[PDB]
Design a protein around this ligand. Structure first.
Ligand SMILES: *[C@@H]1O[C@H](CO)[C@@H](O[C@@H]2O[C@H](CO)[C@@H](O[C@@H]3O[C@H](CO[C@H]4O[C@H](CO)[C@@H](O)[C@H](O[C@H]5O[C@H](CO)[C@@H](O)[C@H](O)[C@@H]5O)[C@@H]4O)[C@@H](O)[C@H](O[C@H]4O[C@H](CO)[C@@H](O)[C@H](O)[C@@H]4O[C@H]4O[C@H](CO)[C@@H](O)[C@H](O)[C@@H]4O[C@H]4O[C@H](CO)[C@@H](O)[C@H](O)[C@@H]4O)[C@@H]3O)[C@H](O)[C@H]2NC(C)=O)[C@H](O)[C@H]1NC(C)=O
Ligand SMILES: CCCCC/C=C\C/C=C\CCCCCCCC(=O)O[C@H](COC(=O)CCCCCCCCCCCCCCC)COP(=O)([O-])OCC[N+](C)(C)C
Ligand SMILES: CCCCC/C=C\C/C=C\CCCCCCCC(=O)O[C@H](COC(=O)CCCCCCCCCCCCCCC)COP(=O)([O-])OCC[N+](C)(C)C
Ligand SMILES: CCCCC/C=C\C/C=C\CCCCCCCC(=O)O[C@H](COC(=O)CCCCCCCCCCCCCCC)COP(=O)([O-])OCC[N+](C)(C)C
Ligand SMILES: CCCCC/C=C\C/C=C\CCCCCCCC(=O)O[C@H](COC(=O)CCCCCCCCCCCCCCC)COP(=O)([O-])OCC[N+](C)(C)C
Ligand SMILES: *[C@@H]1O[C@H](CO)[C@@H](O[C@@H]2O[C@H](CO)[C@@H](O[C@@H]3O[C@H](CO)[C@@H](O)[C@H](O)[C@@H]3O)[C@H](O)[C@H]2NC(C)=O)[C@H](O)[C@H]1NC(C)=O
Ligand SMILES: *[C@@H]1O[C@H](CO)[C@@H](O[C@@H]2O[C@H](CO)[C@@H](O)[C@H](O)[C@H]2NC(C)=O)[C@H](O)[C@H]1NC(C)=O
Ligand SMILES: *[C@@H]1O[C@H](CO)[C@@H](O)[C@H](O)[C@H]1NC(C)=O
Lengths: 438, 258, 149, 41, 112, 85, 196, 34
C-alpha cells in the first residue's frame, strides 16, 4: 500500500549508531504539508530484510517530546505514525523516529586470532528510502573508532568524511522518491562481545500459600563474533589471561545478570549438572560458564532465583479476591539480543484470568494448564506469551495480568490432598474389614 | 558397642564412601575440578550431533551420558577386538593411526592427561594396557619391548624411546606442554620427569579443538585429507622448516604410471 | 533417496534385518549451456560397514528433462545388525567426482516380529498339549470340587 | 582379587567378631532354618 | 585404482527346516486322544463322578468360582493371541479383585 | 487497556500474605504431631475390637480429622523445604 | 525392550535385549510413573535414578527384619534391621548417587530368602511361589542371581543328608524350582542357560 | 539447604535414637515375655 501525497521532507537527518551489537537509528525529520485535504498520518519505509528484524519503533516531537502513536504493520514495507491535533495543510512540523534492530553485520575477516581486533561488515542504504520527496538529507554514522567503506564509489560526492569517532556524509539535496540506487557496505572495529540468544524460555511461578514468586530462565546463547583460526588453544588463552588486564575482547568469561531488588535463592546449572563458578552479590548475579564462549560457540544454561510476592502482586480495590500482577518482561546480561522469547507465567490452580495487557507487541499468546507438585486437579494456569525480537536495553516493560483467586479455591489445595489421604485410609478400612480366610 | 557402631559407621561413610566420581577434589587448596563436564559439555554444545568420539573404553559411558555423542568402545568389554582397534590406534604412528581412525568414521579423539595437576589415572600409565591387548591381536605391528629405553625403563623425557616419541597418544597428550611454564622445561607431576620442546614431535594428521582448564581432557579432531592427494606429513614438512631457500633438481625415481 | 520397496520411508518405519528396500540416485552433466541427463554405466551402489556388504551396479529405469535417474532393484538387507552407510562414490577420471552417503541404523527383529507359534508347522504339538493340560486342569478343579470325599 | 583383614574390620565394626559366634551359637540348637544361615556363612 | 569393481551380494544364512506337516497333525490328534481318554476316564468309567452339587443358595459362589477359574484362562488365552501385557494385567486386576471374594466365600462354605 | 490496568495497578494495596514462611515450619511440625496422633489413634479403632457400626463411625470421623490435618500439614511442610505449594 | 542403541560401539551397535538386565529400569520407571500420575508430584527422572539406593536401603532393612524374625524372635529382627540400615559394607554399594544395579539386588535377595525360609518352615505352596516371583524379579535385576540357585539347593541337599526330610521340604522346594525356573528363563539375557 | 556437619549430626542422631529404642524394645520384650 503506497501513500499518495501530502508530506514533503524539508530536513532529514539519519544517525546510525553501531556501538552495542544492535543497530539503532535516530531519524530527525521536519515535514511540510501541501495545499489539499489536511491528512493526519505518516509512512516510514523499511526494506523487506530489515522489516523482518526490528524490535522498537517510536516517535517524538522535537519542540518538547511527549510521544506519538507509532504503529508497525504486519517489497518495501511501511510503518504508520499517527498525529494528534490534525495539522493545517501548510505548516511545518518536527519529528523524531527512533528504531532498534536485530542484525549487527558479518565479521569481515571471519577467522581472526583471539588477541586481535575484529572488523565487521554492515550493509544498508545511502540514499534514504523515503515514501516522499526530500529537499535536504544528511547522514551521520556515529559509533566506534575506525570506520572504512567497502567498494568506495568513483564519485567524489556521496563519499564519507570522517569525523572524530564519527563518519559523516550523505546525498544532501533533491532525492525524488524511493531510492535503492546504491547500497552501502561499511567495515568497522567493534570490541563488544556480541552475545545473542536464540531461544529464551522463562518460567515464573506465583504462589499464594508461600507468598513468593519464583523465576527460572533457560538461555540458549551463541556468540556471533568472529570465529578463531588455528582452532582453540588453552596455552594462548591462559597466556592471554596472564599477560595483562583482560581489556574488552571477543569471548565470554563472565555474565552480569541484573535481577529484581531482593532476590534470595540463586542457582546456575547447565544441562550436565550444576556449575559452581557463580557469585551472587547484592542486586547482581555474576556467572562464569564452564568453557569461554568464543566466536560461533553455543552454550545453553539455566539460572533461577526467588523473590517475595508482595512487590509484584497487588490486591485490587473493588474485590478482595482479585489480584493484579506486573511481571518484568526481561532480565539478563546488559549486552544481549533475544531472537526468541517465550514468557510463561504460572498462576495457581484455581486462578481465572480476566484481563491481559502487554507493552511490547507480542507474536502470540495462549492459556493452557500444567501440573506441578501437588496439582491433583487440572493444574496451574500457564499464560504464555511469545515475543520474537527483543533487546535487553530497550524493552523495559512489565506484563500486567488481572485475575481472581477466591478463597473457595484457595483452600482447595489442602482439602484436595486431604481428599486423597482420606480415600486412601478408607481404602485401608475396606481392605481390613474384608474376610478372606479359606 | 552399639553406640560406637554408629559413630564408626558414619565416620567411614562420610570419609571413605561419600565422594563424587565427576568432581575431582585433588586440591592442587580445597579446589574442585570439573574438567570432565567442561570437556564433555564442549562435545555436547560445539559438535555436530552425529560425530563419533573415539576415546579409551573406561570413559565410554560418561561420554554417552554427558556429551550425548557416539562412541566406539565402552565400559562393558564384550568385543575385545573392537577395543584392540582403539588400543592399536592410540599406540602407533599417526600415519598408521589416521588410516585406522578414518576407516571407522571417527572425527573426534579425546585423551586424558594428568601431567599439570597430578591425576595419575590419565592415559599414559594405562598406556601399557593399550599395548598388551593390541599386541596379542596384531603382533609385529604394535609390539612391547619397544616403548622402552633398551634397559627396561618406561621413560617419557628425552631419554625415552623413538617408538614412544612417535606414538599417537604421546604427541597428542604432551602437545604444547613444554611451552607451558617458561624456559623450555616442564615438570610432569605424575611421572616426575622433565620434558623439553625439542621432544614432542609435531602432529600433522590431527589438530586440537579443546583443552580443559587444568589440561585434563584434550579433544582432537581428524583434519580432512588433502585436496591435491598428497600425504599430510608432506603438507606439514611443506609449510615449515624446509629448506633455507635451497633446492635440488633430480630424476624423481617414481617408477611408472599404470 | 532410499525407501522401502512398498513405498514407505525410513522415518515412518525404521529399517530391519532382512528387509526389502529400493535406492535411487540421478545424475546430470553440463555441456556449458544446459544440464543434460547423464548416460553412464559403471555406477555402483555400496551398502557398507567397515567392509562393504553390497556393490550393485545401477540400471537407469528413469528419465527427466535435466536428470537421468538410476535404480538398484529390490535388494535384501543383511541379517547382520549394525549401522550401515549407503554410498555412491562415482569416481571416474576425466569427469567430476561425486559422493553421496547416508548413514542409517539397521536393527534386529523385535520380539513381536517373529514367526508365530501357530504359524510354524512344528509347534502344533506343544500348543495342543498345553491346551490339553489346561482343559484337563479345568475339569480337574471342577471335578475335584464337585466330588464328595 | 583377594582382600586383607582391615577391610573386614573396616566394613563391619564389631559385627565381624559376632559373626562367627552367631554361627557357633546357631549350631547348638540346630533347627532346619539355621542350616541356611550356616551354609550362607 | 579407479575403474569398475566386482559385485558383492551377501550370501545369507540358511534356515533350519521346520517339520513334515502331517506328522505334526498325527501327534496333535494323538494328544487329543490322550486328553479325551482322560475325560472319559474321569466322568463315568472310573466312577469319580459328581457325587454332590451345591444346589442351595451357595450355588452362586460356585458359579463365581467357575467364573474365576475359567476367567483367568480366558484372560491368558487372549494374552496368547496379541493383547499386550498391560491390558491383560488390568484385565486380571479387574477380575482378580471381585473374583477373590467370591472364590473365598465358596471355600468358606465348604469344609472338607 | 494498558493504561487503565496500569492506573488500577499502581493505585492498589500490596499482597498481605496469609501465613509467612518463617513461622510455617513450626506449623508443619505441630501439624505433624497432631495428624500423627489422630491417625495413629485411628488404626487402633479398627485395630483392637468393637462392633461394626461404631468402628465405622469412629474410624470415619477420626480419619476425616486426621486426614485434613495431614493435608494442611503437608502443604506447610511442602512450603518449608524449598518447593512451593 | 526392543532398543537397538546405534549410539554405542558405532559400526556394531548394542542390541540391549540380550546384553541388559531390564529390572532396575522398569522399577525406577514404575516409581516415576507411579508418583507421576497416581500420587500428584512430578519429579524428574534423574532424581528417581539418583535417590533409588537410599529408598531401597530401608526395604533391605525391613526384609532383614522379616528374615531374622523367621530365624529367631522379632527382637533380633530389629537388631538385624538396625545393623544393615547403616552398615558400611552395604552403604559402599548403596551410596546416594549409585544406580549401579546392586541397589535393587540385595532388597530382593532378602525378600527371596525371607519367602524361602517362610516357605520351608510351614511347607506352604504359596510362599514358595512368591519366593519364585521374587526370585524371577531378582533375576531381572542382577547377574549374581546364580548364588540363589546354588544356595537354596545347597540348603535342601543338606536337609537330605542330615535325615531331616519331610513333606514340607518337598512341597516347598519342588514348586520353587518349577515356578522359579520356568519364570527365570523369560529374561532374554538368561535364555536356555538354566537348562545347559 | 542443610549443610554437611548438620547432616552428620542428623545421621548420628538417627543412629543413636535407633539403637536406643532397639535396646529399650529388647529389654521390655526380654523381661515381660514367657
Ligand atoms: C568385534 O569387532 C571386530 C572389529 O571391529 C569385528 O571384527 C571384524 O569382523 C568383520 C566381519 O566378519 C571382518 O570382516 C571380514 O574379514 C574377513 C577376513 O578375511 C581375511 O583374509 C582374507 C584372505 O583369506 C583377506 O581377503 C581379508 O582382507 C584382506 O584384503 C582386503 C582387500 O585386499 C583388505 O582390505 C584387508 O585389509 C585384508 O588385507 C582378511 O585378511 C574377510 O574375508 C571378509 O570379507 C568378506 O566379507 C565382506 C562382507 O562381510 C565382503 O565385502 C568381502 O568381499 C568378502 O565377501 C565374501 O563373503 C561374503 C559373505 O560373507 C560373500 O557374500 C562374498 O561374495 C564373498 O564371498 C566369497 O568368499 C567366500 C569365502 O569367504 C565364499 O564362500 C564365496 O563363495 C565367495 O567366493 C570380511 O571383510 C573383519 O575382518 C573383522 N576385523 C577384525 C580386526 O577382526 C568383529 O566382527 C566384532 N565382533 C562381533 C561379534 O561383531
Ligand atoms: C492367579 C493370578 C495369575 C496372574 C499371572 C501374572 C503374572 C505371573 C508372574 C510372573 C510372570 C513372569 C513372566 C514375565 C512376563 C512379562 C514380560 C513382558 O510383558 O514383555 C513381553 C515380551 O517379553 C520380553 O521381552 C521379556 C521381558 C521381561 C520383563 C522384565 C521386567 C520384570 C520386572 C517387573 C517388575 C516391575 C516392578 C513391579 C513391582 C511389583 C511383552 O509382551 P506384549 O506386550 O508384546 O504382549 C503380547 C503377548 N504376545 C507377544 C505373546 C502376543
Ligand atoms: C509416607 C509419609 C511421608 C513420607 C515423607 C518422606 C520424606 C520427607 C522428608 C524430607 C523430604 C524433603 C526434602 C526436599 C529436598 C528439596 C526438594 C527439591 O529440590 O527437589 C524438587 C522435587 O520436588 C519434590 O520432590 C517435592 C517434595 C515435597 C516433600 C514435602 C513433604 C511431602 C511428603 C508427601 C506426603 C504424602 C503425599 C500425599 C499426596 C496425595 C525439585 O524441584 P524443581 O527441580 O522442579 O525446582 C523448581 C521448582 N519450580 C518448578 C516450582 C520452579
Ligand atoms: C506404600 C507407599 C507409601 C506412601 C508414599 C507416599 C508419599 C511418599 C513419597 C514421596 C514423598 C517425598 C519424596 C520426594 C523427595 C525428592 C527429593 C529430591 O529429589 O531432591 C533432589 C535433591 O535433594 C536434595 O538436595 C537433598 C536430598 C533430600 C531427599 C531425601 C530422600 C527421602 C525421600 C524418600 C526416598 C526418595 C523417593 C523419591 C525417589 C524415588 C533435587 O535435585 P535438584 O538438583 O534437581 O534440585 C536442586 C534445587 N534446585 C533445582 C532449585 C536447584
Ligand atoms: C519413612 C520416614 C522418613 C524419615 C526421614 C527421611 C529422610 C530424611 C533424610 C534427610 C533429610 C534432610 C533434608 C535435606 C534438604 C534440606 C532442606 C531443609 O533443610 O529445609 C530447611 C527447613 O526444614 C525444616 O524446617 C523442616 C520442617 C518440618 C519437617 C516436617 C517433616 C515432613 C513430613 C510431612 C508429611 C505429612 C503427611 C503425612 C502422610 C501420612 C530450610 O532449607 P532451605 O533454606 O533450603 O529452604 C528454602 C528457604 N525458605 C525457608 C525460604 C523456604
Ligand atoms: C543449545 O541451543 C542451541 C540454540 O538453539 C541449539 O542449536 C540448534 O540446534 C538445532 C538442532 O541441533 C539446529 O537445527 C539444525 O539446523 C540445521 C540447519 O540450520 C540442520 O542442518 C539440522 O538438521 C538441524 O535441523 C539449530 O540450527 C541450532 N541453532 C543454532 C543457532 O545453532 C542446540 O541444539 C542446543 N543444544 C542442546 C544440547 O540442547
Ligand atoms: C500460538 O500458540 C499456540 C498455543 O496455543 C500454538 O498452537 C499449538 O501449536 C502446536 C504446534 O507446536 C500444536 O501441537 C498445538 O496443538 C497447538 N495448540 C492449539 C491450541 O492450537 C500456535 O501454533 C501458535 N501460533 C504461532 C503463529 O506461533
Ligand atoms: C529422456 O532422456 C533424454 C536424454 O538425452 C532426453 O533428451 C529426453 O528428453 C528424455 N525424455 C523424457 C520423456 O523424459
Amino acid at each position: 500500500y503506497e501513500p499518495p501525497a501530502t508530506w514533503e521532507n524539508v530536513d532529514y537527518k539519519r544517525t546510525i549508531d553501531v556501538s552495542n551489537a544492535y543497530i539503532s537509528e535516530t531519524i530527525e525529520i521536519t515535514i511540510k504539508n501541501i495545499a489539499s485535504e489536511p491528512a493526519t498520518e505518516y509512512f516510514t519505509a523499511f526494506e523487506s530484510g530489515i522489516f523482518s528484524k526490528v524490535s522498537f519503533f517510536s516517535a517524538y516531537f522535537t519542540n518538547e517530546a511527549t510521544f506519538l502513536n507509532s504503529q508497525l504493520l504486519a517489497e518495501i514495507r511501511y510503518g504508520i505514525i499517527q498525529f494528534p491535533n490534525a495539522i493545517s495543510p501548510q505548516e511545518e512540523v518536527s519529528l523524531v523516529i527512533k528504531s532498534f534492530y536485530n542484525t549487527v553485520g558479518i565479521p569481515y575477516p571471519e577467522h581472526v586470532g583471539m588477541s586481535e581486533e575484529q572488523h565487521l561488515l554492515w550493509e544498508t542504504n545511502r540514499l534514504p528510502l523515503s515514501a516522499y520527496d526530500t529537499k535536504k538529507a544528511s547522514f551521520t554514522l556515529i559509533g566506534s573508532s575506525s570506520f572504512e567503506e567497502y567498494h568506495p564509489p568513483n564519485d567524489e560526492s556521496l563519499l564519507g568524511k570522517a569525523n572524530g569517532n564519527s563518519f559523516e556524509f550523505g546525498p544532501w539535496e533533491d532525492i525524488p522518491r524511493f531510492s535503492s540506487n546504491e547500497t552501502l557496505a561499511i567495515v568497522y572495529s567493534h570490541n563488544a562481545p556480541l552475545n545473542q540468544v536464540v531461544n529464551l524460555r522463562r518460567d515464573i511461578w506465583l504462589s499464594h500459600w508461600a507468598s513468593t514468586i519464583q523465576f527460572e530462565e533457560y538461555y540458549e546463547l551463541t556468540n556471533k563474533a568472529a570465529k578463531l583460526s588455528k582452532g582453540f588453544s588453552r596455552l594462548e588463552l591462559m597466556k592471554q589471561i596472564q599477560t595483562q588486564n583482560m581489556r574488552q575482547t571477543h569471548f565470554v568469561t563472565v555474565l552480569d545478570m541484573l535481577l529484581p531488588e531482593g532476590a534470595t535463592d540463586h542457582y546456575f546449572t547447565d544441562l550436565v549438572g550444576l556449575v559452581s563458578t557463580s557469585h551472587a552479590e547484592r542486586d547482581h548475579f555474576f556467572i562464569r560458564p564452564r568453557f569461554p564462549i568464543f566466536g560461533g560457540w553455543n552454550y545453553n544454561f539455566t539460572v533461577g532465583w526467588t523473590n517475595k510476592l508482595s512487590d509484584f502482586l497487588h490486591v485490587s480495590s473493588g474485590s478482595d479476591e482479585k489480584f493484579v500482577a506486573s511481571i518484568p518482561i526481561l532480565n539478563g546480561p546488559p549486552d544481549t539480543v533475544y531472537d526468541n522469547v517465550e514468557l510463561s507465567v504460572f498462576l495457581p490452580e484455581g486462578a481465572e484470568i480476566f484481563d491481559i495487557d502487554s507493552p511490547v507487541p507480542f507474536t502470540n499468546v495462549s492459556i493452557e494448564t500444567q501440573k506441578s507438585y501437588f496439582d491433583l486437579n487440572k493444574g496451574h494456569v500457564k499464560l504464555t506469551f511469545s515475543y520474537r525480537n527483543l533487546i535487553s536495553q530497550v524493552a523495559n516493560g512489565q506484563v500486567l495480568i488481572k485475575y481472581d483467586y477466591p478463597k473457595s479455591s484457595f483452600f482447595k489445595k489442602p482439602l484436595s490432598i486431604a481428599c486423597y489421604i482420606f480415600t486412601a485410609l478408607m481404602g485401608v478400612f475396606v481392605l481390613k474389614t474384608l474376610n478372606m480366610n479359606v | 558397642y552399639l553406640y560406637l557402631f554408629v559413630f564408626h559407621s558414619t565416620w567411614v561413610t562420610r570419609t571413605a564412601y561419600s565422594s563424587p566420581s565427576v568432581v575431582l577434589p585433588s586440591q592442587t587448596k580445597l579446589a574442585l575440578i570439573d574438567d570432565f563436564r567442561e570437556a564433555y559439555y564442549w562435545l555436547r554444545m560445539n559438535s555436530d550431533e552425529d560425530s563419533k568420539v573415539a576415546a579409551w573404553w573406561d570413559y565410554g559411558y560418561q561420554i554417552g551420558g554427558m556429551a550425548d555423542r557416539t562412541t566406539l568402545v565402552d565400559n562393558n568389554t564384550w568385543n575385545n577386538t573392537h577395543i584392540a582397534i582403539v588400543g592399536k590406534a592410540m599406540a602407533s604412528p599417526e600415519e598408521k593411526s589416521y588410516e585406522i581412525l578414518k576407516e571407522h568414521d571417527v572425527d573426534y579423539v579425546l585423551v586424558i592427561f594428568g601431567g599439570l595437576i597430578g591425576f595419575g589415572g590419565d592415559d599414559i600409565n594405562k598406556f601399557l594396557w593399550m599395548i598388551r591387548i593390541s599386541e596379542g591381536i596384531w603382533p609385529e605391528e604394535i609390539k612391547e619391548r619397544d616403548f622402552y629405553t633398551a634397559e627396561g625403563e618406561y621413560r617419557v623425557d628425552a631419554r625415552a624411546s623413538e617408538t614412544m616419541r612417535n606414538s599417537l597418544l604421546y604427541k597428542m597428550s604432551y602437545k604444547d606442554f613444554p611451552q607451558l611454564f617458561n624456559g623450555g622445561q616442564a615438570t610432569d607431576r605424575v611421572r616426575q620427569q622433565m620434558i623439553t620442546p625439542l621432544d614432542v614431535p609435531p602432529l600433522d594428521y590431527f589438530d586440537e579443538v579443546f583443552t580443559s582448564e587444568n589440561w585434563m581432557v584434550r579433544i582432537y579432531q581428524l583434519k580432512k585429507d588433502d585436496a591435491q592427494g598428497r600425504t599430510l606429513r608432506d603438507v606439514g614438512e611443506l609449510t615449515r622448516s624446509s629448506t633455507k631457500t635451497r633446492r635440488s633438481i633430480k630424476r624423481p625415481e617414481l617408477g611408472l604410471r599404470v | 533417496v532410499h525407501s522401502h520397496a512398498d513405498g514407505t520411508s525410513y522415518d515412518e518405519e525404521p529399517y530391519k534385518i532382512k528387509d526389502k528396500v529400493i535406492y535411487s540416485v540421478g545424475f546430470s552433466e553440463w555441456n556449458g549451456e544446459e544440464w543434460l541427463p547423464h548416460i553412464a554405466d559403471d555406477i555402483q551402489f555400496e551398502l557398507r560397514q567397515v567392509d562393504p556388504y553390497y556393490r550393485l551396479t545401477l540400471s537407469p529405469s528413469g528419465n527427466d528433462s535435466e536428470t537421468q535417474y538410476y535404480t538398484t532393484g529390490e535388494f535384501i538387507l543383511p541379517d547382520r545388525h549394525g549401522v550401515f552407510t549407503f554410498l555412491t562414490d562415482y569416481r571416474k577420471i576425466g569427469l567430476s567426482f561425486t559422493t553421496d552417503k547416508d548413514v542409517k541404523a539397521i536393527r534386529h527383529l523385535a520380539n513381536d516380529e517373529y514367526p508365530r507359534s501357530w504359524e510354524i508347522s512344528n509347534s502344533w504339538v506343544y500348543i495342543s498339549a498345553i491346551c490339553g493340560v489346561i482343559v484337563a486342569w479345568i475339569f480337574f478343579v471342577v471335578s475335584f470340587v464337585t466330588t464328595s470325599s | 582379587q583377594p582382600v586383607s583383614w582391615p577391610a573386614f574390620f573396616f566394613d563391619t565394626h564389631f559385627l565381624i567378631w559376632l559373626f562367627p559366634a552367631g554361627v557357633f551359637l546357631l549350631f547348638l540348637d540346630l533347627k532346619d532354618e539355621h542350616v541356611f544361615v550356616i551354609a550362607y556363612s | 585404482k579407479f575403474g569398475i569393481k566386482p559385485e558383492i551380494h551377501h550370501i545369507f544364512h540358511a534356515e533350519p527346516k521346520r517339520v513334515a506337516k502331517p506328522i505334526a497333525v498325527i501327534f496333535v490328534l494323538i494328544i487329543f486322544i490322550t486328553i479325551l481318554s482322560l475325560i472319559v476316564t474321569w466322568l463315568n468309567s472310573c466312577a469319580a463322578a459328581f457325587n454332590n452339587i451345591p444346589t442351595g443358595v451357595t450355588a452362586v459362589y460356585f458359579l463365581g468360582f467357575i467364573a474365576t477359574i475359567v476367567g483367568f484362562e480366558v484372560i491368558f488365552a487372549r494374552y496368547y493371541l496379541g493383547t499386550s501385557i498391560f491390558e491383560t494385567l488390568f484385565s486380571s486386576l479387574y477380575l482378580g479383585a471381585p473374583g477373590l471374594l467370591t472364590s473365598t466365600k465358596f471355600l468358606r462354605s465348604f469344609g472338607q | 487497556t494498558y493504561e487503565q490496568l496500569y492506573k488500577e495497578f499502581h493505585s492498589s494495596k500490596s499482597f498481605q500474605p496469609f501465613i509467612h514462611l518463617d513461622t510455617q515450619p513450626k506449623f508443619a511440625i505441630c501439624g505433624l504431631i497432631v495428624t500423627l496422633a489422630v491417625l495413629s489413634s485411628a488404626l487402633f479403632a479398627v485395630g483392637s475390637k468393637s462392633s461394626y457400626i461404631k468402628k465405622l463411625f469412629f474410624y470415619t470421623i477420626l480419619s476425616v480429622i486426621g486426614s485434613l490435618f495431614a493435608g494442611l500439614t503437608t502443604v506447610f511442610a511442602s512450603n518449608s523445604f524449598g518447593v512451593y505449594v | 525392550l526392543n532398543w537397538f542403541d546405534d549410539r554405542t560401539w558405532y559400526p556394531l551397535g548394542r542390541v540391549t535385549g540380550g546384553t541388559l538386565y531390564p529390572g532396575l529400569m522398569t522399577t525406577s520407571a514404575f516409581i516415576w510413573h507411579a508418583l507421576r500420575n497416581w500420587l500428584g508430584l512430578p519429579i524428574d527422572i534423574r532424581n528417581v535414578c539418583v535417590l533409588f539406593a537410599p529408598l531401597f536401603s530401608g526395604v533391605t532393612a525391613w526384609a532383614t527384619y522379616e528374615f531374622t524374625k523367621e530365624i529367631k524372635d522379632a527382637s533380633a529382627g530389629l537388631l538385624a534391621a538396625g545393623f544393615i540400615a547403616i552398615v558400611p559394607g552395604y552403604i559402599s554399594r548403596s551410596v546416594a548417587g549409585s544406580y549401579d544395579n546392586e541397589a535393587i539386588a540385595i532388597t530382593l535377595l532378602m525378600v527371596t530368602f525371607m519367602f524361602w525360609i517362610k516357605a520351608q518352615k510351614t511347607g506352604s505352596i504359596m510362599h514358595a511361589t512368591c519366593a519364585a516371583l521374587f526370585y524371577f524379579y531378582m533375576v531381572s535385576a542382577w547377574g549374581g542371581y546364580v548364588f540363589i540357585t546354588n544356595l537354596i539347593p545347597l540348603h535342601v541337599f543338606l536337609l537330605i543328608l542330615m535325615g531331616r526330610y519331610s513333606s514340607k521340604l518337598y512341597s516347598a522346594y519342588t514348586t520353587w524350582y518349577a515356578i522359579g525356573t520356568v519364570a527365570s528363563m523369560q529374561i532374554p539375557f538368561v535364555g536356555f542357560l538354566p537348562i545347559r | 539447604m542443610i549443610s554437611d556437619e548438620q547432616l552428620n549430626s542428623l545421621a548420628i542422631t538417627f543412629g543413636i535414637v535407633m539403637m536406643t529404642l532397639i535396646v529399650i524394645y529388647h529389654a521390655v520384650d526380654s523381661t515381660m515375655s514367657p
